[PDB]
Amino acid sequence: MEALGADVTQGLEKGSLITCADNTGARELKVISVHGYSGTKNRHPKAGLGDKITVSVTKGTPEMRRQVLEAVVVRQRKPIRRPDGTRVKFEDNAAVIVDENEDPRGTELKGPIAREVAQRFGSVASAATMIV
């Protein structure tokens, strides 16, 4: 994919439960897979800020629950490194549900978003309120 513009230490794995930072009706997501990733024997597939991931809805509205959807990682607790050397970390781990074309399923995004994610997924960015 297009270079992120920052070095990331993946803070998530297959099975991690994260926040769904949007208004789709899904409150909690479970990471199932990481797009374009291939690990190694015994290694838990890892995902981090900027990665597109296949996800499962653990908490939310009845219609949304149990649905297997795609999403983009917007925030993570494990630090990332920006070109000037500063590390950047968030209060939580969050992803935004996205469709086949990478357009957010929801109308509004909840909480801040990393600028690096904003540049990679333009439509996800346009829906953002705060881009840090």
Partner: protein, 337 residues
């Protein structure tokens, strides 16, 4: 059916034994192109700091912007090309033919060598030129030594001697170039060979770690779960199958780790200066203060502080040289903390 998985560690850096010479020995040199010149230099590792640079990469989205880059400070004072050795081409490969020495020797070169008292530079030279007329001249290299005495942070005064190839135009032009350098006294500097912004291959003997087990030495796993509580934690599964009935040298086993020669490729030289600009507050931990000829190498360099490291024009660069990077800032903040 049992998942695949690459083996533990590379078999290309073996055997994993203690290095014979603490002073690195390049096993290859650059190609012969433009003006003749010494194909290497050397210095002493001091420590690290960071630097803020302006992006040079024309294909980078960040071209022209501030970028923080890690830097290893290496004290690179002037060395002495004390002799010119010539190799002749024989059916058994290259072999030393003769050497042309000088008169001016550093005050403490006698701590390592038996300095010449009676030598004939003209007979050696004559022999060399005659070998060239015959077309048997293999290649030309300079016996070089460092001046540890010029580096206060380094305890030794006993110079470190290494041979550095001279490459360049035609053999005649570089034979003459070599002799000129040597005759003076052999004094040359990092500036004479390298330009800030170029790529160098750095060689050095790694930090010693004595004996270490398979986990640290080869990167094998530790026993997992219940297998970690029975009496085996950091020991591998088995030394091999029933047959062949012998242990193959390829199985990850315990032994000397560290203190091996390594040659790291494509190390961009960020800045070649002199003085105390890169030095750190309180002094480089376990080293001392820098205030003299230095070289800022991008990233890490093999070996501990005080060890002799060697430079060589990159033999296999991936990128084109983007000379003299703009250094906006050089961290001097204490390394303690």
């Amino acid at each position: 059916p049992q998942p695949s998985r690459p083996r533990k560690g590379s078999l290309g850096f073996g055997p994993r034994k203690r290095s014979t010479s603490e002073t690195p020995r390049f096993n290859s040199w650059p190609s012969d192109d433009g003006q003749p010149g010494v194909q290497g230099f050397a210095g002493y590792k001091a420590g690290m700091t960071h630097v803020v640079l302006v992006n040079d990469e024309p294909n980078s989205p960040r071209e022209g912007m501030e970028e923080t880059v890690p830097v290893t400070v290496i004290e690179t004072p002037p060395m002495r090309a004390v002799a010119l050795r010539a190799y002749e081409d024989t059916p058994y490969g290259q072999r030393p033919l003769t050497e042309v020495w000088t008169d001016e020797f550093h005050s403490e070169l006698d701590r390592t060598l038996d300095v010449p008292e009676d030598h004939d530079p003209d007979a050696a030279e004559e022999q060399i030129r005659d070998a060239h007329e015959a077309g048997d001249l293999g290649d030309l290299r300079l016996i070089t030594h460092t001046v540890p005495d010029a580096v206060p942070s380094v305890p030794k005064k006993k110079p470190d001697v290494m041979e550095t190839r001279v490459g360049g135009g035609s053999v005649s032009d570089r034979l003459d170039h070599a002799l000129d350098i040597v005759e003076d006294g052999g004094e040359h500097a990092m500036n004479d060979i390298f330009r800030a912004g170029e790529y160098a291959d750095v060689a050095g003997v790694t930090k010693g770690k004595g004996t270490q087990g398979p986990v640290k030495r080869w990167g094998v796993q530790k026993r997992k779960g219940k297998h970690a509580r029975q009496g085996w934690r950091r020991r591998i599964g088995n030394l091999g199958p029933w047959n062949p009935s012998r242990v193959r040298s390829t199985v990850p086993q315990q032994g000397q780790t560290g203190y091996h020669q390594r040659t790291e490729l494509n190390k961009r030289l960020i800045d070649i200066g002199e003085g105390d600009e890169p030095t750190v507050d309180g002094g480089f931990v376990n080293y001392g203060e820098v205030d003299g000829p230095y070289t800022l190498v991008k990233g890490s360099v093999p070996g501990p502080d005080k060890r002799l490291v060697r430079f060589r024009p990159a033999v296999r660069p991936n990128d084109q040289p983007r000379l003299d990077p703009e250094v906006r800032y050089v961290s001097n903040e204490s390394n303690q903390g």
